[PDB]
Amino acid sequence: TMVSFLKPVLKQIIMAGKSMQLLKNLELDDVHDPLLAITFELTLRSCLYPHIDKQYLDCCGNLMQTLKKDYRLV
């Protein structure tokens, strides 16, 4: 009934979408599909999750950067 195939990173997904929309106001399927081609589907599923995490990390870092400069909160 509930999703559990992306649940360890879903919070970061939602938090990524909103942060990108607040960032702009101031492919991945084609990589995961051959990754399946070349225990299993548990640890292998844990190799998809770096891709979608590093993008969020970059996004929130740039978001906080253009908050610390340019309407400087600190």
From Swiss-Prot:
According to its UniProt record, where is this protein located? Cytoplasm, Cytoskeleton, Microtubule organizing center, Centrosome
Q: Which residues cross the membrane?
A: none
Q: Identify the tissues in which this protein is expressed.
A: Widely expressed, with highest levels in heart and skeletal muscle and moderate levels in brain.
What this protein is reported to do is described as: Component of the gamma-tubulin ring complex (gTuRC) which mediates microtubule nucleation. The gTuRC regulates the minus-end nucleation of alpha-beta tubulin heterodimers that grow into microtubule protafilaments, a critical step in centrosome duplication and spindle formation.
The family annotation for this protein states: Belongs to the TUBGCP family.
Quote the subunit structure annotation. Component of the gamma-tubulin ring complex (gTuRC) consisting of TUBGCP2, TUBGCP3, TUBGCP4, TUBGCP5 and TUBGCP6 and gamma-tubulin TUBG1 or TUBG2. TUBGCP2, TUBGCP3, TUBGCP4, TUBGCP5 and TUBGCP6 assemble in a 5:5:2:1:1 stoichiometry; each is associated with a gamma-tubulin, thereby arranging 14 gamma-tubulins in a helical manner. Gamma-tubulin at the first position is blocked by TUBGCP3 at the last position, allowing 13 protafilaments to grow into a microtubule.
Instruction: Write down what this protein is called.
Output: Gamma-tubulin complex component 5
Which residues of the complete protein appear here?
A: 547 to 717 of 1024
